[PDB]
Amino acid sequence: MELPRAFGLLLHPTSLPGPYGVGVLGQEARDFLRFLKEAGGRYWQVLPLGPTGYGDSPYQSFSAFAGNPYLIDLRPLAERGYVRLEDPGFPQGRVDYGLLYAWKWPALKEAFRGFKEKASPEEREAFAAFREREAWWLEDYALFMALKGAHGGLPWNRWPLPLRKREEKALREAKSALAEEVAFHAFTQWLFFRQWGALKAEAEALGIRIIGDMPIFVAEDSAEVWAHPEWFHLDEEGRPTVVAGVPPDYFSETGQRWGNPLYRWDVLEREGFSFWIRRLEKALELFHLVRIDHFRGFEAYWEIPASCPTAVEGRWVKAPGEKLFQKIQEVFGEVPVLAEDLGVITPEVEALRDRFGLPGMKVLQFAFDXMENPFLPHNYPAHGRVVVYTGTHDNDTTLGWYRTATPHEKAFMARYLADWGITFREEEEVPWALMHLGMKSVARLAVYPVQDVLALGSEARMNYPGRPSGNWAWRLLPGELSPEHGARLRAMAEATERL
Template sequence: MQLKRSSGIILHPTSLPGRFGIGALGAEAYEFVDFLADAGQSVWQILPLGPTGYGDSPYSAFSAFAGNPLLICLERLVETGDLNPEDIEGISFPEGKANYGFVHGFKERLLHQAAHRFRTGASAERRAAFEEFCALQGYWVNDYSLFRVLRSHFDEKSWNQWPTDIRKREEKALQNWREKLGDAIYYHQYAQFIFFEQWFALKGYANSRGIKIFGDIPIFVAFDSADVWANPHLFHLDENGSPTVVAGVPPDYFSATGQRWGNPLYRWDRMAESGFSWWVARFRWNLSQADMVRIDHFRGFEACWSIPVSEETAVNGSWTPVPGEKLFLTLVEVMGEIPVIAEDLGLITPEVEELRDRFGFPGMKVLQFAFGSGPDPDPGNPYLPHNLERRSVIYTGTHDNTTTPGWWQDLSKDEKNAVRSYLGTDGRDIHWDLIRLAMLSVADLSIFPLQDVLGLGASARMNAPGSSAGNWSWRYLPNVLTEELRQRLAGMCRTYGRIPWEETPSFLAG
């Protein structure tokens, strides 16, 4: 993949401001696109857009294909006539934090109301658009909608705890439940239609302003998902539908027991037999929603850490080969060039690097990883800017890191001195120091979280891996995207050759 020298910002849509308790695909999202464009940025990086389940994590979704209804903009539903203005009057949640628990209840009630009004009163044009969506996306939306309805019917129990006939997807049971729960199924189909109607409108606007959407594909899917229930033969499951082996990473410097993620592992032999059709469909759909995608845990396409389900930790796992080369050859053959960035952080083997380079996928570098412990930086550290390759993406930090001011706060005196020595600054504006360092590097694309642009402390971090509480809830406050920030970012883009326009905008001239 060939990247143009450019710059961008990470912000998941849930982190947008707004009065309904969580970010949405409405006016605030369009205003953020305008800020990016006016600040000289070319890329908006997001996290996975799937419907969140356990822990509100976008990396643990009920589907690898569906969108998150919590992101639907209610004001847009008023504009289309699916809701009346009075339906959303008086609703106002505090800013600054995503209130998932509250939002689920009131938004689902309003979406049910909107679905009913759409079903009984939508125009012929919108009704035809809905039917076209359901026909084109039927390969996933029908199973997903039935899965969500059944999960609700069976008290939110995991699908492997449902009655045997529907757990095993016997045709008679599928037909009976579809007939019995038809209205509820329609609701989920409607919610998906609306989500993607709003998402593609936003993406179209972003592209019109010169902003590319940078999406995210987690390598694994959640066990309690429509994907596993609808395709059990593609996963390592026993006769009762329970996983036999699960994913994770082995013990390392950061964890003596490794990480046991719990995702079921793929039956790659069966996927290969079908020409990797599930992966082709997944990549094709994701790349319609984004202009390029990051593959999370890319090393898992060369080999994955397989942990017996009986093990409580990741210690007693083993590396299992994965036919990643065959998969990517198939994707390229079917789709042509695939605009992929490989998340190649951590302990990466030569085999993983060879797979990445075989297909020309840019890798990732994180500046917070560039400075080790002690008073002197290691000049050979691969994350230091003077060691980078052009075909890479450099970050100040990612959604899994603390913010740059938070990282700085945690450093020892010697470590801070080492950073100051490398930067040639006093570190008083450390977030701008690292943004500048990313901008001036040779990496084709520089990315930084909005929290770093705003100079926020550790309390604004998006996710702390290994912690099950308090994640994914940060939102920026209204009116913080100031003219000063816009000018400063745009000026840095011009200075370091990352400006996206062919001609310098008037406000940067002179």
């Protein structure tokens, strides 16, 4: 792809302001695009947009194709008279997922019954046309979700055998018995993609490009895994025999055990890689660029045995990334894909990343704990084909990171900033200082989390890997991201040839 000198902002839609407990795809989503555009930004980065389960994690989704029903704006539904909206008293600046689960799900089911009652026949036909078009994933997803309501919320590999093993009869039966619930689930998707679609056109008109996020491994308890068990390393009970993650590290004694099911790469290859083709086609329908997390996993992955509680035990296994990407380029003609190449990177990963022209990432928060550090701007690629962040959604906010930074990191940070003419007076100025450094760098694309723009502390951290609760809940306050914040970003971009 072509990456011009620009800046953008990272903001998961759940973090948008507005009523009813969670950011949605309506007015405030548009207001934020307007803000971005007037600030000179050309990129909006979001996290995966699928339905969430236990933990509320976008990275542990019930489906690789579906959209998050929590993101649906209920306001258009109320106007059409499908539902009456009663706000139960949501808190400010955070998603109370418990209340959202207890309130938003019923409200959606209400809107569906109300839709069936009053919707015009053209609305019903378009909905039905959507179901026919998206059928190759939707039928499994919608049945998957309905099956949870018939089975106490159990994961697919815990449902009765006939349903777990996907017998034709059991399936056809279940689909008949759960007809209405199956349709409700499909109705959430119809709404999601039409709403996302309208938002994507708004960004397009405003000249903003949306960077999507595609995890390499999908979730154990998900419709696609349930529908293609042969593609993953599962036992006959449908349970992972080995799981994903990363081995012991400099930054992690035990490493991280993700729990994701691992692909049977050889079986995907003989089959033709349709899963990947499908995922990319789909991502490109929603986004202009897509970031693939754990990119190095296309070359080799850490195979953790299921019966091991950490990441300490395991083995590296090669993956046919070279073959997959040659197939992708042959079939798509272009990989508008960004690579997440953090952690320990071998020359085999770099070769493969560079072989396909994929820009990697740089994280400033990791640049000061040691001049040779690759996260320092003077060590960036001569031509700047990289994305620089202060920190991602997995890191603390820059201010938060700085308050707990070691004495040697702070001292070197300040000496390095001065070498670039950047100085600061108070620790609260550190986010902007590092953003300026990133904008002054050769990195074609500087993308910053909105929390750094507001210089927020640790309370506004989005994900703390390792903590099981409290994540993905940060939300902006109405009018918190002000016009002055915009003009300030504009000037920085103007001053650094990013406009």
